[PDB]
Amino acid sequence: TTAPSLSGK
Amino acid sequence: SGSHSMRYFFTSVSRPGRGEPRFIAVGYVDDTQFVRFDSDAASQRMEPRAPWIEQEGPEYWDQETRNVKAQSQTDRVDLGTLRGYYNQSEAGSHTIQIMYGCDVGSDGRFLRGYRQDAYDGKDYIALNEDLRSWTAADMAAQITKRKWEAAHEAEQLRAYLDGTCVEWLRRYLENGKETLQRTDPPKTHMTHHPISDHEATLRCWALGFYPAEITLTWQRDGEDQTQDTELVETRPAGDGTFQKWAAVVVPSGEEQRYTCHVQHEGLPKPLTLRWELS
Amino acid sequence: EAIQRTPKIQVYSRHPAENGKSNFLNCYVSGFHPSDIEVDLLKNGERIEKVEHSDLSFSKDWSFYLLYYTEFTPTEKDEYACRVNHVTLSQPKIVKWDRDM
């Protein structure tokens, strides 16, 4: 399963 | 050896005046694709690509689809932000590439985690192997590093890379064990192609091997030849195995002086191959 | 974009080729950047229509790769090739299927 998304660069 | 990995690869490509960026997500266990999302395909869902993942339920497919689409939206925002950091126009196509995952031992124990990001095909930022710090490639990327440090991004990602990632990889290896817990050693041979009356190409072949990692090396009288060797990229057969070759041009009548050495995790011994007329 | 990498093109069969035995013809294109590319598999110079392709992925140096493939039965006389177009090429590159590589 995929990871939670990081916040914006 | 008998180590395993789970890796996701993401590519976002902007196409100004032709739509939202192309987004492609691929998931792999070892060297075997199991899932994909493509913004340009019919369904707009994460989709199965290996028969053992198909047995997952509608709630698994729903959650992966929502999660992959949020990765897509972040990357799309990042394409705008990075264009500003690198001072680039609204008219050109740019690329964000991301890869992350974890490795485990043959006994299912965590070995390591990784995440790497690129912009227009060069390093942007990476998570270090300690999973608590970053390395930025240049001064644009250090702005991202400062944001991610302040927001404690590594600590949330670490819990996925050494907790969630590893446990799901262990599940997938179990659910897929008939297919994924196999090692196919390479079927090797050597071919011979004259290019004149006085010279010939010796080509050392490996076929049908899995997983993809392999080393092919030429020696002359046991001295290395790595600068006069042509190597091709390790290429997929399309049946779940890989192929590769390495070649050397030699004087006709001195073939027996060269040897090809093959290293694969599925090989009892390293193989040593030699062209002998007699 | 800032960098540009020329595709490396390999044209080969899934299994050791045998005249009259169905097989798969592969065009593996790797080492390229940016990702915009066009690949066609050709039979006696004509575009084969039922061709599949892998999901875009990439190597350690960030260069992209893709596999295009189609069912075929090799013969002595049929000429097969892969045609690739990419921004780094002055014209589309045609690489011919050769049983020895």
Chain B residues within 8 angstroms (CB to CB) of chain A: 8, 25, 27, 60, 63-64, 67-68, 70-71, 73-74, 77-78, 81-82, 100, 117, 124-125, 144, 147-148, 151, 153, 156-157, 160-161, 164-165, 168
Contact between A8 and B77 (Cβ < 8 Å): yes
B83 contacts chain C (CB < 8 A): no
Residues in chain A: 9
C92 interfacial to chain B (CB closer than 8 Å): no
The data reach a resolution, in angstroms, of 2.2
What's the gap in Å between the CA of B216 and the closest CA on chain C? 16
| C-alpha to C-alpha distance for B119 and B212, rounded to whole angstroms | 26
10 Å Cβ neighbour count for C79? 11
| C-alpha span between B63 and A3 (Å, rounded) | 11
Closest CA to C89 of C9, C2, C10: C9
Determine contact, residues B235/B189, Cβ cutoff 8 Å. Answer: no
Q: Do B200 and B254 form a contact (C-beta atoms < 8 A)?
A: no
d(CA C82, CA C40): 6
Interface contact B47, partner C, CB < 8 A: no
In the complex, which subunits touch A with 3 or more CB pairs below 8 angstroms?
Answer: B
d(CA C50, CA C20): 20
Residues of C in contact with B11 (CB under 8 A): 35, 56-58, 64
What token pair was written down for B55?
């047995």
Domain boundaries, chain B: 1-182, 183-278
B14 token code pair = 């902007």
**Alpha carbon C54 to its chain's center:** 11
Alpha-helical regions (H) of B86-227: 139-150, 153-159, 165-175, 177-180
CB pairs under 8 A between A and B: 54
Edge-to-edge strand list for the sheet holding C80-85: C46-47, C38-43, C80-85, C93-96
Measured between beta carbons, the chain C residues lying within 8 angstroms of B191 are: 100
Q: Does B135 contact chain C (CB < 8 Å)?
A: no
From the candidate CATH numbers 2.160.10.10, 3.40.190.150, 2.60.40.650, 2.60.40.10, the one assigned to the domain spanning B183-278: 2.60.40.10
Among partner residues B82, B100, B125, which is closest to A3 by beta-carbon distance? B100
Report the run of H or E that residue C27 belongs to, with start and end: strand C23-32
Q: Tell me which residue of C73, C63, C91, C62 sits closest to C25, measured CA to CA.
A: C73
Contacts with C33 from chain B: Cβ below 8 Å? 95, 121
Do chains A and B touch, with touching meaning 3 or more CB–CB pairs less than 8 Å apart? yes
* Residue spans of alpha helices (H) in B11-119: 58-85
Q: What is the largest CA-CA distance in chain A?
A: 23
Integer angstrom CA distances of residue B135 from B64, B131, B147, C34: 29, 11, 13, 24
* Chain A residues with beta carbon closer than 8 angstroms to that of B144: 9
Q: How far apart are CA B195 and CA B238, in angstroms?
A: 31
CATH of the domain at C33: 2.60.40.10
Question: Please, what is the angle between helix B139-150 and helix B58-85, to 10°?
Answer: 130
Cβ within 8 Å of residue B190, ≥6 positions away: B202, B203, B204, B205, B260, B273, B274, B275
The token duo for B126 is 């990476």
State which residue of chain B sits closest to C2, comparing Cα positions.
B120
What count of CB pairs under 8 Å joins B to C?
Answer: 86
Cis before B211 (ω within 30): yes
Number of domains in chain C: 1
Tokens of residue B60, six digits = 């698994």
Q: Which residues of A touch B147 (CB under 8 A)?
A: 7-9
C-beta atoms surrounding C20 within 10 Å: 8
Q: Does C51 touch chain B (CB under 8 A)?
A: no
B116, B131 Cβ separation under 8 angstroms: no
3-state secondary structure of B157: helix
In chain A, residues 1-9 whose CB comes closer than 8 Å to chain B: 1-9
Q: Judge contact between B241 and B32, C-beta under 8 A.
A: no
Inter-residue long-range contacts of B174-182, CB under 8 Å, 24+ positions, other chains counted: B175/B52, B175/B53, B175/B55, B176/B29, B176/B32, B176/B34, B176/B50, B176/B52, B176/B53, B178/B52, B179/B32, B179/B50, B179/B51, B179/B52, B179/B240, B180/B4, B180/B29, B180/B30, B180/B32, B180/B52, B182/B210
DSSP string, C39-90: EEEEETTEEPSS-EE---EE-TTS-EEEEEEEEE---SS--EEEEEE-TT-S
Q: What are phi and psi of C5, to 5 degrees?
A: -120, 130
Question: Per the structure block, which two tokens stand in for C85?
Answer: 């177009």
Lookup: tokens for B2? 């008998």
> Annotated binding site for a peptide antigen: which residue ranges of B?
8, 74, 85, 117, 144, 147, 160, 172
Question: What would the DSSP string read from start to end of B193-216?
Answer: EESSSSEEEEEEEEEEEBSS--EE
CATH number, span B1-182: 3.30.500.10
Give the minimum alpha-carbon distance from B208 to chain A in angstroms, rounded to a whole number.
29
Tell me whether residue B112 is exposed, middle or buried, using C-beta atoms within 10 angstroms of its C-beta: 0 to 12, 13 to 18, 19 or more.
middle
- Nearest CA-CA distance, residue C37 and chain B, Å: 13
Judged by phi (left if over 0) then psi (alpha if -120 to 50, else beta), residue B2 lies in left
Q: Please, are residues C66 and C53 in contact by the beta-carbon 8 Å criterion?
A: yes
Q: Which residues contact B172 (CB under 8 A, 6 or more apart)?
A: B6, B29, B34, B52, B53, B180
Residue B102 to residue B116: CA distance in whole angstroms:
12
Provide the residue range defining the domain that includes C65: 1-101
Considering only the beta carbons, identify the residue of A1, A5, A8 that sits closest to B168: A1
- Which subunits have 3 or more CB–CB pairs within 8 Å of chain C? B
